[PDB]
RNA sequence: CACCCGUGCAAAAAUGCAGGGGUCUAAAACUGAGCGGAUAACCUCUCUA
């Protein structure tokens, strides 16, 4: 199922001039040159330890059998022939967009007769795509509740503050929007970015500088810019002092929190590991534990230590409920034992495991490999793991916490994560960006960024080894330090999720908490304020207060939900039975019994139905008696504790279902803001390439129309379909007649205003900002893609209900009500702006082909 | 179960086979990671808000 060429070890098959360079897998993603192929002749590079031998070379195929791992044989294609054969006959291929010459001429200073620089440039574009997703998400988080979309680094707070007495309404209203935002309590959910210990809100200067660095990032990543500001993400060393200082202060605090007293906070794990590693010096063990836990070196070593631990401790008896309070320490130190074993004594085994994982053809093969390695690790570490578990008793952890250890930090401090004065402004800004995401988004951003920078570094080293012109342009010299940025980003990914600067739950936080949970309609605003006074006690009982704080405010599900949704809006969206039920049967049985075992005191369909009924009929007053049972201990068998765990299961289920809905909707919108970022970027790229595209702000389909060669005559596309326009397209995607005809037909069925509104509700995330009203009447939710496009099309209907709509748009909106679901034709109608990129158009207009995790059938 | 590309055969211009694709998607292999519905320098629960 997986690629045999990768299993055989073929990292890449490049193409420079008439020669073809085959590269192999090094340490991780490092690429080492293996063979150079010049017209059916192969010259073996990397003679000692070759990853693969190539037993026969043809002009149209390189047969390669694998040395490393299982001896698998593969056939690989000649890149010079990538667009030749059955059509001069050997030329370096162009990218699908046919933008490769312009990308080379823009990132570097000249066209390149090879097939490596474009490979690097597409990874840079992937970087910008991910940042376009996540700066947009951060701005939507700040706007959830025309100002954040015009924030420029060029003006500091000392110049933005002069807009208090601005004689002009635009500047005065911008400053008033800034004040109305900082005065918002919602900044308390952005506490890492906006709250400092003195917890107080950061001063207005830092408050504004965070917003400027975030909004300018969004503007850069979505709007292709002109002038010096086009390279703003890469010329960040020119940031003003205020922005540098705010980047520093936001980045330093997790670093300072973790490495100020690493011995003290990690004393329990350090001591119990010193018990296992008696022969090891305590300073060495402390440095290794920093490397493992803070720096996360156990994840960079080319195999899943987490998978090995899970397969080793599968059924040995540590799945019992007793260790749940211990399980974090137990898993951490099992991973540490495995790690230290792999650097110290099982380095050969780690290499022999990475090789067989790379050479494996199936996930079943990877599973068997991990299982066998975990069997060996268990048989090696039965007593080590038993010692770890025994020395994690509650009394034992208490005594370990009270003990005094004066461990030498000289060897530890050589591994301390660099402070903000050493890391770069780009990675500091990336951390500041990460301050406005959930944890899953945290990973999807920072791990993808380290992947892309690692790819760029590997390409740069390959081109240096081949002697190719590696020099980026003076404006893109940022990527000449790609190795340094990769190191910084991996270091940041190590500790980005490790620190949470959570604040004491404010009164407005508690207001959001019950609003997201549900209140009876008849209760007035003063009544809700009186219930807040009851929670906060204006003898004393903070039981319900603490229950609401722990279960709702401190739940990252609710944290996410107030990051990207008004609590009242989320509560309203909790009332759509089809959409909540859809998440209900997406959560598996294993994760449904977790809630039902507490919400019960028989069939899974009935269980999910009643769970969804509870999500629909949930309110504060069902939990208003939490002052009685919150003081109980969930682990006990008292009825107060049982009811406490029941309410915890209900609240967690509701918040998690809403979290899943909102996260999936935001992810689907993230794919479309990728699409529109690509539209806007490729517009400028094609304009540089001499394509006649024109202004795309006015009409977002200008790019696809320019690529297809069609032009609207009197507002409608009057050019018909013929093979000539298909074959003379501006890119490889639309060289085919069938999908050219389909995209032309769907272009004729769209309109400028609807497409512009779709772009606006995608970038500004208004479809989610108004999720409650955009989800009112939905019949079923076959997938999150369907729900997102129903929200989008309902948003389009609401704005275009009292305006002139073309016949096709009217038919789409009528089909919206004829059966209450999104229009599978409207999606491809307003998705035409990125129809030029046929793969993206197909993915974003066809369900099943949208997401990788739930693949479905193509609708042709 | 997308798109494209190479090759072999049938084709009279596209279908079976076998593959490849970092240079096709959110999308190369190991990882990291997402899907995903607890993970986190900090035992847990209570406490503190
Ligand atoms: Mg790519």
Author numbering: 58 to 144, 148 to 205, 215 to 267, 276 to 615, 624 to 686, 692 to 950
Paper lines:
After binding the target RNA, the ribonucleoprotein (RNP) is activated to cleave the target (*in cis*), and other RNAs nonspecifically (*in trans*). Cas13-family enzymes differ in how they recognize the target RNA, but all use two higher eukaryotes and prokaryotes nucleotide-binding (HEPN) domains to cleave the phosphate backbone. Here, we investigated the molecular mechanisms of Cas13d mismatch surveillance and nuclease activation using a combination of cryo-EM structural analysis and quantitative kinetics.
A central hallmark of this structure is a kinked crRNA and a Helical-1 domain that is docked and interacting with the N-terminal domain (NTD). In the binary state, the crRNA is bulged towards its 3’-end and makes the distal spacer more exposed to the solvent.
